[PDB]
Design a binder for this molecule. Structure first.
Ligand SMILES: *SCCNC(=O)CCNC(=O)[C@H](O)C(C)(C)COP(=O)(O)OP(=O)(O)OC[C@H]1O[C@@H](n2cnc3c(N)ncnc32)[C@H](O)[C@@H]1OP(=O)(O)O
Length: 116
Protein backbone atom coordinates (compact mmCIF):
# COMPACT_ATOMS: atom_id res chain seq x y z
CA UNK A 1 0.00 0.00 0.00
CA UNK A 2 0.98 3.64 -0.52
CA UNK A 3 -2.17 5.80 -0.24
CA UNK A 4 -4.69 4.62 2.35
CA UNK A 5 -8.16 6.01 3.15
CA UNK A 6 -9.35 5.45 6.74
CA UNK A 7 -13.13 5.18 7.23
CA UNK A 8 -13.82 5.91 10.92
CA UNK A 9 -10.66 7.98 11.45
CA UNK A 10 -11.16 9.95 14.66
CA UNK A 11 -9.68 12.78 16.72
CA UNK A 12 -10.46 10.72 19.85
CA UNK A 13 -7.07 9.27 21.00
CA UNK A 14 -8.87 6.34 22.65
CA UNK A 15 -10.36 5.19 19.34
CA UNK A 16 -8.68 2.92 16.77
CA UNK A 17 -9.61 5.54 14.10
CA UNK A 18 -7.00 7.80 15.75
CA UNK A 19 -4.47 5.13 16.81
CA UNK A 20 -4.34 3.62 13.31
CA UNK A 21 -4.10 7.07 11.63
CA UNK A 22 -1.10 8.01 13.81
CA UNK A 23 0.54 4.58 13.36
CA UNK A 24 0.24 4.58 9.54
CA UNK A 25 1.53 8.19 9.26
CA UNK A 26 4.51 7.27 11.47
CA UNK A 27 5.30 4.50 8.96
CA UNK A 28 5.37 6.96 6.01
CA UNK A 29 1.97 6.10 4.48
CA UNK A 30 -0.21 8.82 2.95
CA UNK A 31 -3.45 8.59 4.96
CA UNK A 32 -6.74 10.21 4.07
CA UNK A 33 -9.15 10.29 7.01
CA UNK A 34 -12.83 9.80 6.31
CA UNK A 35 -15.37 10.90 8.97
CA UNK A 36 -18.27 13.47 8.62
CA UNK A 37 -17.61 14.70 12.23
CA UNK A 38 -14.20 16.26 11.49
CA UNK A 39 -12.96 18.77 8.94
CA UNK A 40 -9.32 17.82 9.80
CA UNK A 41 -7.46 15.21 11.86
CA UNK A 42 -3.75 15.72 12.76
CA UNK A 43 -4.00 18.72 10.38
CA UNK A 44 -4.97 16.40 7.52
CA UNK A 45 -8.01 17.14 5.39
CA UNK A 46 -10.84 14.81 6.56
CA UNK A 47 -13.39 13.64 3.93
CA UNK A 48 -17.16 13.45 4.57
CA UNK A 49 -17.55 10.32 2.47
CA UNK A 50 -15.62 7.91 0.28
CA UNK A 51 -17.34 9.46 -2.80
CA UNK A 52 -15.05 12.52 -2.37
CA UNK A 53 -11.81 10.52 -2.28
CA UNK A 54 -9.19 10.83 -5.04
CA UNK A 55 -9.30 7.86 -7.42
CA UNK A 56 -5.65 6.89 -6.73
CA UNK A 57 -6.33 5.62 -3.16
CA UNK A 58 -4.80 2.09 -2.94
CA UNK A 59 -6.96 0.65 -0.15
CA UNK A 60 -9.87 1.76 2.02
CA UNK A 61 -9.46 0.65 5.67
CA UNK A 62 -12.74 0.36 7.70
CA UNK A 63 -12.88 0.89 11.46
CA UNK A 64 -16.67 1.53 11.81
CA UNK A 65 -19.54 -0.80 12.99
CA UNK A 66 -20.66 -3.31 10.27
CA UNK A 67 -24.05 -1.62 9.72
CA UNK A 68 -22.18 1.59 8.81
CA UNK A 69 -19.53 -0.38 6.91
CA UNK A 70 -22.11 -2.02 4.60
CA UNK A 71 -23.41 1.42 3.46
CA UNK A 72 -19.90 2.84 3.02
CA UNK A 73 -18.65 -0.25 1.14
CA UNK A 74 -21.54 0.19 -1.33
CA UNK A 75 -20.51 3.88 -1.82
CA UNK A 76 -16.85 2.88 -2.21
CA UNK A 77 -17.67 0.24 -4.87
CA UNK A 78 -20.01 2.68 -6.68
CA UNK A 79 -17.13 5.23 -6.66
CA UNK A 80 -14.87 2.63 -8.30
CA UNK A 81 -12.77 1.42 -5.38
CA UNK A 82 -11.73 -2.23 -5.51
CA UNK A 83 -9.61 -2.93 -2.35
CA UNK A 84 -11.54 -2.76 0.93
CA UNK A 85 -9.86 -3.75 4.24
CA UNK A 86 -12.01 -4.37 7.32
CA UNK A 87 -10.42 -4.22 10.79
CA UNK A 88 -11.63 -7.02 13.08
CA UNK A 89 -15.06 -6.01 14.39
CA UNK A 90 -15.97 -4.05 11.24
CA UNK A 91 -16.72 -7.14 9.10
CA UNK A 92 -19.98 -9.05 8.57
CA UNK A 93 -21.36 -11.82 6.38
CA UNK A 94 -23.75 -9.30 4.74
CA UNK A 95 -20.66 -7.28 3.76
CA UNK A 96 -18.97 -10.48 2.57
CA UNK A 97 -22.06 -11.30 0.44
CA UNK A 98 -22.09 -7.84 -1.17
CA UNK A 99 -18.30 -7.81 -1.79
CA UNK A 100 -18.17 -11.32 -3.31
CA UNK A 101 -21.05 -10.28 -5.64
CA UNK A 102 -19.27 -6.99 -6.57
CA UNK A 103 -16.04 -8.91 -7.28
CA UNK A 104 -13.72 -6.59 -5.33
CA UNK A 105 -10.69 -7.56 -3.19
CA UNK A 106 -11.29 -7.44 0.56
CA UNK A 107 -9.71 -8.42 3.86
CA UNK A 108 -11.45 -9.75 7.00
CA UNK A 109 -9.78 -10.69 10.31
CA UNK A 110 -6.40 -9.06 9.65
CA UNK A 111 -4.94 -6.21 11.66
CA UNK A 112 -3.63 -3.31 9.45
CA UNK A 113 -0.95 -2.14 11.95
CA UNK A 114 0.32 -5.72 12.30
CA UNK A 115 0.32 -6.28 8.53
CA UNK A 116 2.15 -2.99 7.87
S1 LIG B 1 -6.87 -5.94 14.79
C1 LIG B 1 -6.16 -5.32 16.35
C2 LIG B 1 -6.56 -3.86 16.58
N1 LIG B 1 -7.97 -3.76 16.75
C3 LIG B 1 -8.79 -3.00 16.08
O1 LIG B 1 -8.48 -2.21 15.16
C4 LIG B 1 -10.21 -3.17 16.55
C5 LIG B 1 -11.10 -2.53 15.57
N2 LIG B 1 -12.52 -2.68 15.84
C6 LIG B 1 -13.23 -1.96 16.73
O2 LIG B 1 -12.70 -0.97 17.55
C7 LIG B 1 -14.71 -2.21 16.77
O3 LIG B 1 -14.99 -3.58 16.54
C8 LIG B 1 -15.33 -1.34 15.66
C9 LIG B 1 -16.82 -1.65 15.56
C10 LIG B 1 -14.69 -1.60 14.28
C11 LIG B 1 -15.13 0.16 15.96
O4 LIG B 1 -15.73 0.45 17.22
P1 LIG B 1 -16.04 1.95 17.66
O5 LIG B 1 -16.65 1.97 19.04
O6 LIG B 1 -14.76 2.70 17.63
O7 LIG B 1 -17.13 2.40 16.58
P2 LIG B 1 -17.78 3.87 16.46
O8 LIG B 1 -19.28 3.74 16.36
O9 LIG B 1 -17.29 4.81 17.54
O10 LIG B 1 -17.18 4.32 15.03
C12 LIG B 1 -15.82 4.68 14.89
C13 LIG B 1 -15.78 6.08 14.24
O11 LIG B 1 -16.36 6.05 12.93
C14 LIG B 1 -17.27 7.14 12.83
N3 LIG B 1 -18.30 6.96 11.79
C15 LIG B 1 -19.62 6.63 11.95
N4 LIG B 1 -20.22 6.62 10.73
C16 LIG B 1 -19.29 6.94 9.80
C17 LIG B 1 -19.33 7.06 8.42
N5 LIG B 1 -20.47 6.87 7.76
N6 LIG B 1 -18.17 7.40 7.73
C18 LIG B 1 -16.99 7.61 8.41
N7 LIG B 1 -16.95 7.47 9.77
C19 LIG B 1 -18.08 7.16 10.46
C20 LIG B 1 -17.85 7.35 14.22
O12 LIG B 1 -18.52 8.62 14.39
C21 LIG B 1 -16.56 7.14 15.03
O13 LIG B 1 -15.75 8.30 15.09
P3 LIG B 1 -15.93 9.40 16.27
O14 LIG B 1 -15.93 10.78 15.68
O15 LIG B 1 -14.79 9.21 17.20
O16 LIG B 1 -17.29 9.21 16.87
Amino acid sequence: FRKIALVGASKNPAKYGNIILKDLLSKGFEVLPVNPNYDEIEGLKCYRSVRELPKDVDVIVFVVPPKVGLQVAKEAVEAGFKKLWFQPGAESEEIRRFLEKAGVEYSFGRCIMVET
